[PDB]
Design a protein around this ligand. Sequence first.
Ligand SMILES: O=C(O)c1c(C[C@H]2c3ccccc3C[C@H]2O)ccc2c1OCO2
Ligand SMILES: O=C(O)c1c(C[C@H]2c3ccccc3C[C@H]2O)ccc2c1OCO2
Ligand SMILES: [Cl-]
Ligand SMILES: [Cl-]
Lengths: 148, 148
Amino acid sequence: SPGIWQLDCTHLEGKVILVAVHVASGYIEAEVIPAETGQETAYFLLKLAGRWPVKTVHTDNGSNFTSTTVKAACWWAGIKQEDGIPYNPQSQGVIESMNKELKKIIGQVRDQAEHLKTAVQMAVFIHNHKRKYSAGERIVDIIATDIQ
Amino acid sequence: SPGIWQLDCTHLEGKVILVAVHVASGYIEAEVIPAETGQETAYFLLKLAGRWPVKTVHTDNGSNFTSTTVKAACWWAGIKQEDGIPYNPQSQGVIESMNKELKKIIGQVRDQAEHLKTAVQMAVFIHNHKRKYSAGERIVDIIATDIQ
Ligand SMILES: O=C(O)c1c(C[C@H]2c3ccccc3C[C@H]2O)ccc2c1OCO2
Ligand SMILES: O=C(O)c1c(C[C@H]2c3ccccc3C[C@H]2O)ccc2c1OCO2
Ligand SMILES: [Cl-]
Ligand SMILES: [Cl-]
């Protein structure tokens, strides 16, 4: 459970926002990319796994699940790649709500930033600090408890 | 303190590697950029502060300390910007050693990656997972203890 992440891809301003959600906490990392390729997804996962103890990733679609570049990155970083099929059917809706929430925050800050990527990182900041404990506090506690 | 980070800028292959070190743990995040500008530094700090509770940043040089863009980002993200003057000189040597260590790891992986940025993220991974507890474990424990 402390090592489980979910990939999520959403669209805005003709660009792609790639999101990784730490399932147990709601903590996110996100990046803007031109389009979702295996290459971009692989690089994003490498970055993520160097920063947090990523054990399992539920991939966002079959193309990234199949991608040999994504598979190579998961092998390199010690990540178990799984499908992201919501067998638990509250998963679809929960991701959906987050995408809407994220886009809402992006809209609230969009004017403060010249570039979309900046607005997205502002949204990541606001999302992870929002007291609901915050997601940032929850992920740290979950992983610390797991280490001890 | 759990919230103290140090900026560090090093060069490789005609490019710039921007590093943020969590001082108490040795945990790092890093990115490759064309050159160290206020703009790049500001964006990097925004990303960092959305991911970890950054209270204080010791800037790597006077240009980033002075930069109005860096100051704007620090204001936005609630970061206290300080100088990075090694009033204790066992600080300057510790950064030196890390840059050398990082470049060594980069050399050990460079061949596995087409692009420098990939090799840098591999080096971040290896550095943060290396048991000596790992840096990744230490940062999580320090911040968890601080929350609770
Ligand atoms: O080759 C690259 O640098 C490169 C790769 C592949 C590499 C890679 C990436 C992650 C982990 C191991 C390895 C090994 C290796 O397969 C993928 C995506 C990228 C890349 O550059 C930017 O986006
Ligand atoms: O405007 C941008 O998007 C932009 C900025 C400035 C913005 C910014 C950046 C961080 C925090 C607050 C604010 C407010 C605002 O000043 C800086 C660097 C960048 C940017 O784009 C990529 O690198
Ligand atoms: Cl946070
Ligand atoms: Cl780690």
